[PDB]
Amino acid sequence: SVGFIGAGQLAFALAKGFTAAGVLAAHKIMASALRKMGVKLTPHNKETVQHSDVLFLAVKPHIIPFILDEIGADIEDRHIVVSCAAGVTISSIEKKLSAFRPAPRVIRCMTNTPVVVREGATVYATGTHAQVEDGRLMEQLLSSVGFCTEVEEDLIDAVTGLSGSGPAYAFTALDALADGGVKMGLPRRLAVRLGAQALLGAAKMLLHSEQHPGQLKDNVSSPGGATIHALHVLESGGFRSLLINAVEASCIRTRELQSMADQ
Amino acid sequence: NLYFQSMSVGFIGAGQLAFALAKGFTAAGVLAAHKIMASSPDMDLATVSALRKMGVKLTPHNKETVQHSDVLFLAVKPHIIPFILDEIGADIEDRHIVVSCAAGVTISSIEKKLSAFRPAPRVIRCMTNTPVVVREGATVYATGTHAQVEDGRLMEQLLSSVGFCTEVEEDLIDAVTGLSGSGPAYAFTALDALADGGVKMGLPRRLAVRLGAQALLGAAKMLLHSEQHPGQLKDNVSSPGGATIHALHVLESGGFRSLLINAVEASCIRTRELQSMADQE
Amino acid sequence: NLYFQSMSVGFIGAGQLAFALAKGFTAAGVLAAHKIMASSPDMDLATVSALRKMGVKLTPHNKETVQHSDVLFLAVKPHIIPFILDEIGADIEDRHIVVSCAAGVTISSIEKKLSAFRPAPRVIRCMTNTPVVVREGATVYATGTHAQVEDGRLMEQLLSSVGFCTEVEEDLIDAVTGLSGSGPAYAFTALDALADGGVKMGLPRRLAVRLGAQALLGAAKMLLHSEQHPGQLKDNVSSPGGATIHALHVLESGGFRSLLINAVEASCIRTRELQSMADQE
Amino acid sequence: SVGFIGAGQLAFALAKGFTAAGVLAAHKIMASALRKMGVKLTPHNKETVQHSDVLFLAVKPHIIPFILDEIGADIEDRHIVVSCAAGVTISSIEKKLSAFRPAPRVIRCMTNTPVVVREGATVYATGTHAQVEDGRLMEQLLSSVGFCTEVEEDLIDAVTGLSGSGPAYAFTALDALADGGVKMGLPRRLAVRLGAQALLGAAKMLLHSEQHPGQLKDNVSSPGGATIHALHVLESGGFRSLLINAVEASCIRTRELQSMADQ
Amino acid sequence: MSVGFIGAGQLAFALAKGFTAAGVLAAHKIMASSPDMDLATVSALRKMGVKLTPHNKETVQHSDVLFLAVKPHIIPFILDEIGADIEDRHIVVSCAAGVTISSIEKKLSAFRPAPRVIRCMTNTPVVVREGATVYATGTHAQVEDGRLMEQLLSSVGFCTEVEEDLIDAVTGLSGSGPAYAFTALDALADGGVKMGLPRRLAVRLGAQALLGAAKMLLHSEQHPGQLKDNVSSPGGATIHALHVLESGGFRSLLINAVEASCIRTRELQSMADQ
């Protein structure tokens, strides 16, 4: 049994991904188009906690404690509490929950919206009292909707900057690539389709290759060709540096949010 | 569905594109490796020996590839095409469909050269990309004057086995080159850079490369499976005050969007130049 | 609908905002001009004499405005608010709703000052903008500790007569200031620049000003009447190879988008500073 | 009776605008959601021309002649031919049509998509054989869906750069303003609503004022305030120059398209 | 002596207002003609005492000195309209942007030989009698014509004779100059408002600062760099501010403007000479 606290864009994404995986029946999950896929709903978080065994929390960082205060009394020995809330630290969750019952089993998750098409990127960190089997169960569950691996909690800020914010970098890139295609005479719908297919195929090539991305870049840029001409104009605008800047900005903002959680 | 489990394919050229197409086609099961022959001027390349291990037939003689083939792919550097056409023109038969992947080389230029030998050559111009090697390529094609309707149908069936494929008017192919032709190199560059940023912020390189590649693959699949605008998805995922909208602002401040427009335009314009450089000679 | 055709409104301040609100309210017919009183320290301003011609009552004495009013708008420079509250605090009655439009001045700071005199002051914080003068303003409000539910309802009815109006949590008002508070100045700047571009390309200035203002008004109305994303509308209107997508590229190359993000952020941050500068004193 | 040749985004926009104006009944217009509002449809341009008195042409520039060749024989004395096609010159239309019948009555229109909410910006130029009453009828028709005025044909390129492309500049601006609002903590939907309302209100203020936009800027920027701080950061990025660059780029591209028409 | 204006735009008004404010001409001796005269320009000119008429030929018949202050591409049309009405007594003074003495003489010479033509590059501050004007004399202008022109244009500001091939550069500098100043003053006022000044005071102080600095330079033998040195105390506010101007290439932007305006003027002279 799984539950969600928050019905944001990441709650639906995970529920859609889990049900599409066939790893969970839609009626064994309740949250606090969901009904269309057969997801029980409620406006009282206490009802989800009662229902749940593994319990997800999807809320804004500054909202989490209020759910914890409300449900803290109902956390049982059986519960694994999995927080996806951006910037909320394991420490802040355990401190709240330990006021009610000692040894809350807490896992901190950093996932992304492509779990909705089962191509997510997820990392997780295990809390003070999570047993070894809890982390293994987490990895098996989140592996059903994409890549999943364990990290130390102090890398989640960096992961956020890369694969957490990554999809938005890609949506920005795909909008611009389609603008470029339209400038050069392509219909908008075809430009969006072609750019998305190019990025998907390149990403899969890299994941299926043992080679460096620079190596694949080299392999595809013929001497004097169209592609190396285009790579030059990327380089002249500092394209690489902007993506480094982005990962860094999102990571650093996550640290500022983690500090507000730990205040 | 058209029956072609018994047709032969040839590549003039044995480089990255010929390898990627042969690998994708055989992995799709639509062609048996022994029905594929590729010819290379320098048969000491890495792509050549990998074609051998696949079971493709390799030869130094372009005429042998022609005599083997029903579908004939031209996958050589562009300024080589006029010499290849002179070399094999008299070996083109009525059965041949000639599929040019040479960037910028136009249908008219190919038909002009081949018409000197036998009238009505069946020519298709293709714009595809290396991710056909994992069957996720992006392919467009344009059909020539003497290409029968069934030739375009066969073309689309074959290239759809290794990725997206659709027919366009020839005058869009230069723009497609700037977008999905060059597209994978833009993504490889972005992925190297994203991984550098992950490493700067403390991730191991191997994990940074894996995470950034998975983010890009997932985002692209989301867009393809959504009816929605990429701006709508950007809005959907960017929580107020959060890490992502902070990172998007630093992308905007460097003109990130404009660089990708610049790239599509430059690749397209260079493709037009190569085509005009061709015809001046 | 709440009956208030018989309540009196007062403005502390008689500047641009007080004029714009009085003009919008009277043009909406929701208030008669003689039910409005405004007080100014310098009654030699242009806004003062225009208020006179409208039929608004003008006075130099802030206490007289308070004794006249049921709804009391504070529309003065921000660092003036502490002195005004000291001056009129003992004149606040149980009937008064105090509506602060002072940028950055927080509900807590106002309630602290007014609580010294009479407990439970009814305070609402407003963030509105000058286009209320043509009844197309953008207004948000936040209700204070002692504001009854009906006070927020009355507030929204009144401010909705002159534009969009909705209730927010107080901690969004700084961001609203950066966006719709300052927004009209960003548009005036853009319209001057657009007109310069029209004149450069040969249009008469008067026509350039009219065309650019109409383009902006129409585009904004389209967005408000569409469910769609502004990126979707940008895609809808940008024909392949056309004039508009060429112009969008030059906007992107200068980081146009990032400048507007920078502007919203700077106005918001300055608004936070003014609020913190307040409380340090 | 009115007809449309092309069912692009501008054909629907005009038909939606005319029907919303009550200046035309939807069934007195045919094109070559339209049926939903009661607009007769057909795939043969010759059928619209037969049906029509005033005849609009909405097609890509490089497509116009093919409609003219197809319908040229059917143009009658009664017809006013109104081209909205981007970059297609009066000269290129009259030259094609005069091969069939002398003295075609041609008007060249530069309108924009906000005609769909009856806030368009339209200019028109009258051709060699348009009578005076034709231009007056045009102005009355296009005034029902926004501002309309006559110009010389050699200003249409400039108008395109300003009010033709203008709405896209505004959609770009509104997306960025909403990104800024979201960065500073606002929900996306509220940020989009507030920014659009701010731009609409500012534009209306300017249209209802006799004052200069600089004058309204001055009137609203209080000393030391939030707004003048934000205006400074616009100025430091050359904000004004980018909008000049845009009007110029769209105008110049229109000239290049007019040259392809006149080749 | 009497003066005519073909054209009633901002520059013909400025000259007419300046000439009348100077008293060198009684306004009833001034005629202006336009096919569509601005609503406020009619009332201002009529209250000024300026005779108004829609027919360019009435202006010509009325005038001894005849200013042409119209959009450049209109000029060939004007010259063909009035060319037959030019007499020996006429001095034709062109203010039209980039219209060359050659293009005017070629047109006028078709009607009567030896048209007396002067080309003028003036600016709008003639309206407050602080204009900057240069002029070039044409092939058949007599020596006394140039003298009369300089005496007239000196009544409303600085005036000196130049070779015609410097008028493009003069356009870039003093012709366009006032607009550079108006742009500068708006920005300086934004800066004053940013730092806490009321808009009205900021506008007044910046305009007064510019006026006084320009007068200092005019009344000085000294280099502008030398005046900059005299007012910049060590470590002070002013040298700090000059540094941030330097870091943005302030000087280069003004050189760019002069050059761009000059070069645009040459493009307009080519169109006239086409």
PDB file of N, CA and C in Angstrom, chain E residues 39-105:
ATOM      1  N   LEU E  39      -2.916  70.731 -36.744  1.00  0.00           N
ATOM      2  CA  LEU E  39      -3.990  71.519 -36.141  1.00  0.00           C
ATOM      3  C   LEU E  39      -3.433  72.595 -35.213  1.00  0.00           C
ATOM      4  N   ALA E  40      -2.516  72.211 -34.319  1.00  0.00           N
ATOM      5  CA  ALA E  40      -1.917  73.181 -33.407  1.00  0.00           C
ATOM      6  C   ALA E  40      -0.921  74.093 -34.117  1.00  0.00           C
ATOM      7  N   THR E  41      -0.304  73.631 -35.208  1.00  0.00           N
ATOM      8  CA  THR E  41       0.657  74.491 -35.888  1.00  0.00           C
ATOM      9  C   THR E  41      -0.037  75.671 -36.565  1.00  0.00           C
ATOM     10  N   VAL E  42      -1.241  75.464 -37.108  1.00  0.00           N
ATOM     11  CA  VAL E  42      -2.005  76.573 -37.691  1.00  0.00           C
ATOM     12  C   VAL E  42      -2.283  77.642 -36.637  1.00  0.00           C
ATOM     13  N   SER E  43      -2.812  77.228 -35.480  1.00  0.00           N
ATOM     14  CA  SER E  43      -3.184  78.203 -34.463  1.00  0.00           C
ATOM     15  C   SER E  43      -1.958  78.925 -33.916  1.00  0.00           C
ATOM     16  N   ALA E  44      -0.847  78.210 -33.758  1.00  0.00           N
ATOM     17  CA  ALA E  44       0.363  78.852 -33.259  1.00  0.00           C
ATOM     18  C   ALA E  44       0.938  79.817 -34.291  1.00  0.00           C
ATOM     19  N   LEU E  45       0.976  79.405 -35.557  1.00  0.00           N
ATOM     20  CA  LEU E  45       1.481  80.301 -36.590  1.00  0.00           C
ATOM     21  C   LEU E  45       0.557  81.493 -36.786  1.00  0.00           C
ATOM     22  N   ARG E  46      -0.762  81.274 -36.746  1.00  0.00           N
ATOM     23  CA  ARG E  46      -1.677  82.392 -36.962  1.00  0.00           C
ATOM     24  C   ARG E  46      -1.615  83.379 -35.802  1.00  0.00           C
ATOM     25  N   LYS E  47      -1.518  82.878 -34.566  1.00  0.00           N
ATOM     26  CA  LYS E  47      -1.333  83.768 -33.422  1.00  0.00           C
ATOM     27  C   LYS E  47       0.019  84.466 -33.480  1.00  0.00           C
ATOM     28  N   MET E  48       1.032  83.790 -34.035  1.00  0.00           N
ATOM     29  CA  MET E  48       2.330  84.405 -34.286  1.00  0.00           C
ATOM     30  C   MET E  48       2.240  85.568 -35.273  1.00  0.00           C
ATOM     31  N   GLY E  49       1.201  85.603 -36.103  1.00  0.00           N
ATOM     32  CA  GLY E  49       1.120  86.536 -37.207  1.00  0.00           C
ATOM     33  C   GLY E  49       1.583  85.981 -38.540  1.00  0.00           C
ATOM     34  N   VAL E  50       1.886  84.685 -38.626  1.00  0.00           N
ATOM     35  CA  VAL E  50       2.389  84.115 -39.875  1.00  0.00           C
ATOM     36  C   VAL E  50       1.231  83.872 -40.837  1.00  0.00           C
ATOM     37  N   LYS E  51       1.366  84.363 -42.064  1.00  0.00           N
ATOM     38  CA  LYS E  51       0.368  84.056 -43.075  1.00  0.00           C
ATOM     39  C   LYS E  51       0.480  82.584 -43.452  1.00  0.00           C
ATOM     40  N   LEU E  52      -0.669  81.929 -43.637  1.00  0.00           N
ATOM     41  CA  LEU E  52      -0.724  80.509 -43.968  1.00  0.00           C
ATOM     42  C   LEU E  52      -1.512  80.299 -45.252  1.00  0.00           C
ATOM     43  N   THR E  53      -1.111  79.288 -46.027  1.00  0.00           N
ATOM     44  CA  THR E  53      -1.745  79.011 -47.315  1.00  0.00           C
ATOM     45  C   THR E  53      -1.465  77.564 -47.696  1.00  0.00           C
ATOM     46  N   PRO E  54      -2.393  76.902 -48.387  1.00  0.00           N
ATOM     47  CA  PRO E  54      -2.129  75.535 -48.849  1.00  0.00           C
ATOM     48  C   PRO E  54      -1.338  75.463 -50.151  1.00  0.00           C
ATOM     49  N   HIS E  55      -1.179  76.566 -50.877  1.00  0.00           N
ATOM     50  CA  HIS E  55      -0.666  76.544 -52.249  1.00  0.00           C
ATOM     51  C   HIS E  55       0.782  77.010 -52.261  1.00  0.00           C
ATOM     52  N   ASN E  56       1.702  76.071 -52.515  1.00  0.00           N
ATOM     53  CA  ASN E  56       3.130  76.394 -52.549  1.00  0.00           C
ATOM     54  C   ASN E  56       3.429  77.566 -53.470  1.00  0.00           C
ATOM     55  N   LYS E  57       2.647  77.731 -54.538  1.00  0.00           N
ATOM     56  CA  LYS E  57       2.921  78.820 -55.460  1.00  0.00           C
ATOM     57  C   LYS E  57       2.626  80.178 -54.841  1.00  0.00           C
ATOM     58  N   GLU E  58       1.681  80.247 -53.900  1.00  0.00           N
ATOM     59  CA  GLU E  58       1.453  81.507 -53.198  1.00  0.00           C
ATOM     60  C   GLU E  58       2.667  81.889 -52.359  1.00  0.00           C
ATOM     61  N   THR E  59       3.256  80.908 -51.674  1.00  0.00           N
ATOM     62  CA  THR E  59       4.470  81.142 -50.893  1.00  0.00           C
ATOM     63  C   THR E  59       5.574  81.706 -51.779  1.00  0.00           C
ATOM     64  N   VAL E  60       5.837  81.032 -52.904  1.00  0.00           N
ATOM     65  CA  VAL E  60       6.872  81.472 -53.836  1.00  0.00           C
ATOM     66  C   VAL E  60       6.601  82.896 -54.297  1.00  0.00           C
ATOM     67  N   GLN E  61       5.363  83.176 -54.706  1.00  0.00           N
ATOM     68  CA  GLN E  61       5.037  84.521 -55.152  1.00  0.00           C
ATOM     69  C   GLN E  61       5.240  85.544 -54.043  1.00  0.00           C
ATOM     70  N   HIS E  62       4.968  85.160 -52.798  1.00  0.00           N
ATOM     71  CA  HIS E  62       5.151  86.049 -51.656  1.00  0.00           C
ATOM     72  C   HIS E  62       6.616  86.268 -51.269  1.00  0.00           C
ATOM     73  N   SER E  63       7.512  85.323 -51.546  1.00  0.00           N
ATOM     74  CA  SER E  63       8.793  85.255 -50.838  1.00  0.00           C
ATOM     75  C   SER E  63       9.980  85.752 -51.662  1.00  0.00           C
ATOM     76  N   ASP E  64      10.962  86.321 -50.962  1.00  0.00           N
ATOM     77  CA  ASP E  64      12.270  86.608 -51.541  1.00  0.00           C
ATOM     78  C   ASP E  64      13.248  85.484 -51.201  1.00  0.00           C
ATOM     79  N   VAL E  65      13.336  85.149 -49.920  1.00  0.00           N
ATOM     80  CA  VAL E  65      14.085  84.000 -49.455  1.00  0.00           C
ATOM     81  C   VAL E  65      13.089  82.882 -49.204  1.00  0.00           C
ATOM     82  N   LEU E  66      13.351  81.724 -49.789  1.00  0.00           N
ATOM     83  CA  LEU E  66      12.399  80.623 -49.797  1.00  0.00           C
ATOM     84  C   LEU E  66      13.052  79.389 -49.197  1.00  0.00           C
ATOM     85  N   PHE E  67      12.629  79.022 -47.966  1.00  0.00           N
ATOM     86  CA  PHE E  67      13.070  77.801 -47.310  1.00  0.00           C
ATOM     87  C   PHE E  67      12.272  76.576 -47.773  1.00  0.00           C
ATOM     88  N   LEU E  68      12.961  75.487 -48.035  1.00  0.00           N
ATOM     89  CA  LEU E  68      12.315  74.214 -48.331  1.00  0.00           C
ATOM     90  C   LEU E  68      12.595  73.302 -47.153  1.00  0.00           C
ATOM     91  N   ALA E  69      11.549  73.027 -46.351  1.00  0.00           N
ATOM     92  CA  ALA E  69      11.692  72.266 -45.110  1.00  0.00           C
ATOM     93  C   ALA E  69      10.636  71.175 -45.128  1.00  0.00           C
ATOM     94  N   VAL E  70      10.879  70.164 -45.959  1.00  0.00           N
ATOM     95  CA  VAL E  70       9.948  69.078 -46.212  1.00  0.00           C
ATOM     96  C   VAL E  70      10.744  67.787 -46.191  1.00  0.00           C
ATOM     97  N   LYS E  71      10.028  66.679 -46.185  1.00  0.00           N
ATOM     98  CA  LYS E  71      10.711  65.404 -46.253  1.00  0.00           C
ATOM     99  C   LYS E  71      11.507  65.337 -47.560  1.00  0.00           C
ATOM    100  N   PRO E  72      12.738  64.816 -47.525  1.00  0.00           N
ATOM    101  CA  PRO E  72      13.585  64.815 -48.737  1.00  0.00           C
ATOM    102  C   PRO E  72      12.923  64.283 -50.003  1.00  0.00           C
ATOM    103  N   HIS E  73      12.257  63.132 -49.936  1.00  0.00           N
ATOM    104  CA  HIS E  73      11.674  62.564 -51.152  1.00  0.00           C
ATOM    105  C   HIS E  73      10.550  63.417 -51.728  1.00  0.00           C
ATOM    106  N   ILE E  74      10.024  64.376 -50.965  1.00  0.00           N
ATOM    107  CA  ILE E  74       9.035  65.310 -51.488  1.00  0.00           C
ATOM    108  C   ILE E  74       9.667  66.383 -52.383  1.00  0.00           C
ATOM    109  N   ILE E  75      10.959  66.668 -52.202  1.00  0.00           N
ATOM    110  CA  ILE E  75      11.577  67.826 -52.852  1.00  0.00           C
ATOM    111  C   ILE E  75      11.433  67.792 -54.376  1.00  0.00           C
ATOM    112  N   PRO E  76      11.816  66.710 -55.074  1.00  0.00           N
ATOM    113  CA  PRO E  76      11.654  66.717 -56.542  1.00  0.00           C
ATOM    114  C   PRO E  76      10.247  67.093 -56.962  1.00  0.00           C
ATOM    115  N   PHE E  77       9.254  66.703 -56.157  1.00  0.00           N
ATOM    116  CA  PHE E  77       7.877  67.052 -56.475  1.00  0.00           C
ATOM    117  C   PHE E  77       7.656  68.544 -56.300  1.00  0.00           C
ATOM    118  N   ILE E  78       8.196  69.121 -55.217  1.00  0.00           N
ATOM    119  CA  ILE E  78       8.063  70.561 -54.999  1.00  0.00           C
ATOM    120  C   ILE E  78       8.739  71.329 -56.123  1.00  0.00           C
ATOM    121  N   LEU E  79       9.978  70.953 -56.448  1.00  0.00           N
ATOM    122  CA  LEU E  79      10.732  71.715 -57.439  1.00  0.00           C
ATOM    123  C   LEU E  79      10.026  71.717 -58.785  1.00  0.00           C
ATOM    124  N   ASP E  80       9.429  70.591 -59.174  1.00  0.00           N
ATOM    125  CA  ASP E  80       8.675  70.594 -60.421  1.00  0.00           C
ATOM    126  C   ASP E  80       7.409  71.429 -60.301  1.00  0.00           C
ATOM    127  N   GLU E  81       6.808  71.497 -59.109  1.00  0.00           N
ATOM    128  CA  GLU E  81       5.596  72.303 -58.954  1.00  0.00           C
ATOM    129  C   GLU E  81       5.899  73.798 -59.040  1.00  0.00           C
ATOM    130  N   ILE E  82       6.929  74.259 -58.324  1.00  0.00           N
ATOM    131  CA  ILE E  82       7.204  75.694 -58.245  1.00  0.00           C
ATOM    132  C   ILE E  82       8.255  76.169 -59.237  1.00  0.00           C
ATOM    133  N   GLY E  83       8.934  75.253 -59.944  1.00  0.00           N
ATOM    134  CA  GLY E  83      10.112  75.629 -60.724  1.00  0.00           C
ATOM    135  C   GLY E  83       9.850  76.750 -61.700  1.00  0.00           C
ATOM    136  N   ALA E  84       8.686  76.723 -62.342  1.00  0.00           N
ATOM    137  CA  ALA E  84       8.334  77.755 -63.306  1.00  0.00           C
ATOM    138  C   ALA E  84       8.142  79.113 -62.650  1.00  0.00           C
ATOM    139  N   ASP E  85       7.951  79.146 -61.328  1.00  0.00           N
ATOM    140  CA  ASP E  85       7.625  80.365 -60.600  1.00  0.00           C
ATOM    141  C   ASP E  85       8.835  81.000 -59.920  1.00  0.00           C
ATOM    142  N   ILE E  86       9.980  80.316 -59.925  1.00  0.00           N
ATOM    143  CA  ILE E  86      11.236  80.893 -59.465  1.00  0.00           C
ATOM    144  C   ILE E  86      11.654  82.026 -60.396  1.00  0.00           C
ATOM    145  N   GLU E  87      12.037  83.156 -59.811  1.00  0.00           N
ATOM    146  CA  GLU E  87      12.499  84.332 -60.534  1.00  0.00           C
ATOM    147  C   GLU E  87      13.971  84.585 -60.221  1.00  0.00           C
ATOM    148  N   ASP E  88      14.497  85.662 -60.807  1.00  0.00           N
ATOM    149  CA  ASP E  88      15.869  86.063 -60.514  1.00  0.00           C
ATOM    150  C   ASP E  88      16.032  86.477 -59.050  1.00  0.00           C
ATOM    151  N   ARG E  89      15.024  87.144 -58.477  1.00  0.00           N
ATOM    152  CA  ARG E  89      15.112  87.638 -57.105  1.00  0.00           C
ATOM    153  C   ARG E  89      15.166  86.530 -56.061  1.00  0.00           C
ATOM    154  N   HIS E  90      14.840  85.294 -56.414  1.00  0.00           N
ATOM    155  CA  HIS E  90      14.699  84.272 -55.393  1.00  0.00           C
ATOM    156  C   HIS E  90      16.055  83.745 -54.927  1.00  0.00           C
ATOM    157  N   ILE E  91      16.197  83.569 -53.611  1.00  0.00           N
ATOM    158  CA  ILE E  91      17.215  82.696 -53.030  1.00  0.00           C
ATOM    159  C   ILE E  91      16.497  81.495 -52.449  1.00  0.00           C
ATOM    160  N   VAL E  92      16.864  80.303 -52.906  1.00  0.00           N
ATOM    161  CA  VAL E  92      16.229  79.070 -52.490  1.00  0.00           C
ATOM    162  C   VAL E  92      17.168  78.419 -51.501  1.00  0.00           C
ATOM    163  N   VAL E  93      16.686  78.274 -50.261  1.00  0.00           N
ATOM    164  CA  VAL E  93      17.432  77.735 -49.138  1.00  0.00           C
ATOM    165  C   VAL E  93      16.830  76.384 -48.783  1.00  0.00           C
ATOM    166  N   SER E  94      17.571  75.305 -49.021  1.00  0.00           N
ATOM    167  CA  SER E  94      17.070  73.965 -48.758  1.00  0.00           C
ATOM    168  C   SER E  94      17.498  73.484 -47.380  1.00  0.00           C
ATOM    169  N   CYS E  95      16.520  73.105 -46.541  1.00  0.00           N
ATOM    170  CA  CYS E  95      16.808  72.392 -45.303  1.00  0.00           C
ATOM    171  C   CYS E  95      16.529  70.889 -45.378  1.00  0.00           C
ATOM    172  N   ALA E  96      16.070  70.383 -46.515  1.00  0.00           N
ATOM    173  CA  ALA E  96      15.645  68.991 -46.644  1.00  0.00           C
ATOM    174  C   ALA E  96      16.835  68.052 -46.497  1.00  0.00           C
ATOM    175  N   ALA E  97      16.662  67.023 -45.653  1.00  0.00           N
ATOM    176  CA  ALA E  97      17.760  66.158 -45.258  1.00  0.00           C
ATOM    177  C   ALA E  97      18.373  65.440 -46.460  1.00  0.00           C
ATOM    178  N   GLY E  98      19.679  65.643 -46.622  1.00  0.00           N
ATOM    179  CA  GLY E  98      20.440  64.965 -47.636  1.00  0.00           C
ATOM    180  C   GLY E  98      20.107  65.375 -49.043  1.00  0.00           C
ATOM    181  N   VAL E  99      19.308  66.419 -49.235  1.00  0.00           N
ATOM    182  CA  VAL E  99      19.045  66.894 -50.597  1.00  0.00           C
ATOM    183  C   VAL E  99      20.200  67.796 -51.003  1.00  0.00           C
ATOM    184  N   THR E 100      20.888  67.419 -52.079  1.00  0.00           N
ATOM    185  CA  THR E 100      22.119  68.063 -52.530  1.00  0.00           C
ATOM    186  C   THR E 100      21.838  69.337 -53.331  1.00  0.00           C
ATOM    187  N   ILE E 101      22.808  70.256 -53.305  1.00  0.00           N
ATOM    188  CA  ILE E 101      22.683  71.462 -54.116  1.00  0.00           C
ATOM    189  C   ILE E 101      22.538  71.082 -55.587  1.00  0.00           C
ATOM    190  N   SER E 102      23.326  70.106 -56.029  1.00  0.00           N
ATOM    191  CA  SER E 102      23.240  69.593 -57.397  1.00  0.00           C
ATOM    192  C   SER E 102      21.829  69.130 -57.767  1.00  0.00           C
ATOM    193  N   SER E 103      21.186  68.326 -56.923  1.00  0.00           N
ATOM    194  CA  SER E 103      19.853  67.839 -57.281  1.00  0.00           C
ATOM    195  C   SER E 103      18.861  68.990 -57.430  1.00  0.00           C
ATOM    196  N   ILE E 104      19.002  70.041 -56.625  1.00  0.00           N
ATOM    197  CA  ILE E 104      18.081  71.172 -56.705  1.00  0.00           C
ATOM    198  C   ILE E 104      18.361  72.008 -57.950  1.00  0.00           C
ATOM    199  N   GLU E 105      19.629  72.375 -58.151  1.00  0.00           N
ATOM    200  CA  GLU E 105      19.968  73.175 -59.333  1.00  0.00           C
ATOM    201  C   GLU E 105      19.580  72.449 -60.619  1.00  0.00           C
TER     202      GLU E 105
END
